Short mmCIF file of C-alpha atoms in Angstrom, two decimals:
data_model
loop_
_atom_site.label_atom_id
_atom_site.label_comp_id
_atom_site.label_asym_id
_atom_site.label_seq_id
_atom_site.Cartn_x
_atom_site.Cartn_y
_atom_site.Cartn_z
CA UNK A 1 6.26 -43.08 27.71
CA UNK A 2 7.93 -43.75 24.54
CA UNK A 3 11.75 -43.42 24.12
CA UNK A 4 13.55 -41.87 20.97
CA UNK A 5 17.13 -42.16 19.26
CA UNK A 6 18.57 -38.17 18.47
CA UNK A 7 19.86 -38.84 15.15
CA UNK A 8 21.86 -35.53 15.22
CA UNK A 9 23.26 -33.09 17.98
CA UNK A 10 20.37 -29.72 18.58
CA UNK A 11 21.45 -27.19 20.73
CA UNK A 12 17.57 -24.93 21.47
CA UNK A 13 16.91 -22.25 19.78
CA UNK A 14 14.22 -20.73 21.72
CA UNK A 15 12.76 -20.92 25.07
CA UNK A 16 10.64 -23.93 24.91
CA UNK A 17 12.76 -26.34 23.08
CA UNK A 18 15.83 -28.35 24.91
CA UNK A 19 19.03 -29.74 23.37
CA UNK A 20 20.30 -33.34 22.63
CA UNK A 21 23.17 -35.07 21.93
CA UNK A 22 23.36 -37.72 18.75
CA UNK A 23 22.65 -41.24 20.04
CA UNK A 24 20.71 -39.03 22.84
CA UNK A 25 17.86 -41.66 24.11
CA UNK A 26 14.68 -39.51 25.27
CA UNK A 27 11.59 -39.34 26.67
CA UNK A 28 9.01 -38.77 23.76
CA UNK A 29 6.14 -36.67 25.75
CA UNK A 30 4.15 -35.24 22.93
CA UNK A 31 4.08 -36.18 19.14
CA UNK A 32 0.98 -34.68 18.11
CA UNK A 33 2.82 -32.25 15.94
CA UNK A 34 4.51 -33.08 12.65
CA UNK A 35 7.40 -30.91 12.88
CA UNK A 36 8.44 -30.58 16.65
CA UNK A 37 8.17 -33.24 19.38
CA UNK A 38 8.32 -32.60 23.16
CA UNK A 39 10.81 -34.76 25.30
CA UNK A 40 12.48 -34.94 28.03
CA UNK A 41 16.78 -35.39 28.35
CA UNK A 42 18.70 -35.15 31.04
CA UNK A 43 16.62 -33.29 33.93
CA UNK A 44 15.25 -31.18 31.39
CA UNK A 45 11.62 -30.78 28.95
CA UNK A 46 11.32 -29.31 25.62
CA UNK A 47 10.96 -29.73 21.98
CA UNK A 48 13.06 -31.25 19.25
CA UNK A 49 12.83 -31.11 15.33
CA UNK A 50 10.75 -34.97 15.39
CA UNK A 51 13.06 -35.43 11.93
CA UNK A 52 15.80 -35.51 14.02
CA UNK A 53 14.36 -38.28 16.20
CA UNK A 54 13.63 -42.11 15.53
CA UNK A 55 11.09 -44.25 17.54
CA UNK A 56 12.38 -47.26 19.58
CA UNK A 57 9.16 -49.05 19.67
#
């Protein structure tokens, strides 16, 4: 799909969200929701505050 920029480091902090690195490029699976999007880094799915996220369209 789409691919996103991490803007800052996110380590999860619960079950269904993963972690990222700042300058991270990811998978953008699901934006549907204002606050958390679901992507996919490094082997691995989950969601991300989408603030902390840009779009590379």
């Amino acid at each position: 799909k789409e691919l996103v920029l991490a803007l800052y480091d996110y380590q999860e902090k619960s079950p269904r969200e993963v972690t990222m690195k700042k300058g991270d490029i990811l998978t953008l699976l699901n934006s549907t929701n204002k606050d958390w999007w679901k992507t996919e880094v490094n082997g691995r799915q989950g969601f991300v505050p989408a603030a902390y996220v840009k779009k590379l369209d």
